[PDB]
Amino acid sequence: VTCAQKFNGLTVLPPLLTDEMIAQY
Amino acid sequence: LIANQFNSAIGKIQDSLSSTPSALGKLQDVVNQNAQALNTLVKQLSSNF
Amino acid sequence: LVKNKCVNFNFNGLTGTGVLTESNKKFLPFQQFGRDIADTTDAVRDPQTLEILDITPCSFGGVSVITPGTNTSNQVAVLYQDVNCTEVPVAIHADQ
Ligand SMILES: *[C@@H]1O[C@H](CO)[C@@H](O)[C@H](O)[C@H]1NC(C)=O
Ligand SMILES: *[C@@H]1O[C@H](CO)[C@@H](O)[C@H](O)[C@H]1NC(C)=O
Ligand SMILES: *[C@@H]1O[C@H](CO)[C@@H](O)[C@H](O)[C@H]1NC(C)=O
């Protein structure tokens, strides 16, 4: 399955559960 | 025999996921839909209205 | 010309706002501006020095206030989303 430099008020909030924590689950 | 069958099935899942590129269609489709919506939202700033 | 500092640049009447940095993009002789998907100016050619500068906007982000209940306590913590801690506004800049 496949950081964007959008400066028009668009932002991507990081997920609370990191990929490491999901892998630990 | 059952253990060998289970191991071979897991190996075949490994191979099918590695080879076929469109195996993860659903997640890629979700990502593409979100990215396309964001791109359309950005591109809407170029129109005069 | 002021680089690496957020300024209210006015390039031939462009009257934009952002921080100017040296750009490696090669403008053709007949073009003086560079836009993007949102049709906002991204790179400009200096009318005097004839150099290409990238217009990226000033560091912006949301402010999230981490607080317990007011009946519980009064202290709060502030989260600056997608902002490095090295960024230090000494003067008043928007929030707080
Ligand atoms: C004066 O005009 C020339 C011609 O474009 C330019 O090369 C030069 O940089 C200008 N002077 C200054 C101080 O920028
Ligand atoms: C929350 O506020 C109410 C009314 O202000 C108060 O009675 C209650 O004790 C508070 N909760 C805590 C945990 O202090
Ligand atoms: C913040 O800046 C420091 C040094 O300038 C760098 O090492 C670090 O990776 C940066 N953090 C982020 C999230 O960009």
Nearest to A14 by CA among C67, C75, C61: C61
Resolution given for this structure, in angstroms: 2.8
β-pair type (C63-66, C77-80): antiparallel
Helices (H), chain C: none
Residue C38 sits at the chain B interface (C-beta within 8 Å):
yes
Question: Are C39 and B39 inside 8 Å of each other by CB?
Answer: no
Q: How far apart are alpha carbons A16 and A25 in whole angstroms?
A: 14
CB contact under 8 A, B28 and A2: yes
Give the Cα separation of A22 and B28 in Å (integer).
19
Q: Please give the distance, rounded to the nearest whole angstrom, from the Cα atom of residue A3 to the centre of ligand 3.
A: 15
Cβ(B43)–Cβ(C37) below 8 Å: yes
Q: For residue C74, give the ligand nearest its CA.
A: 2
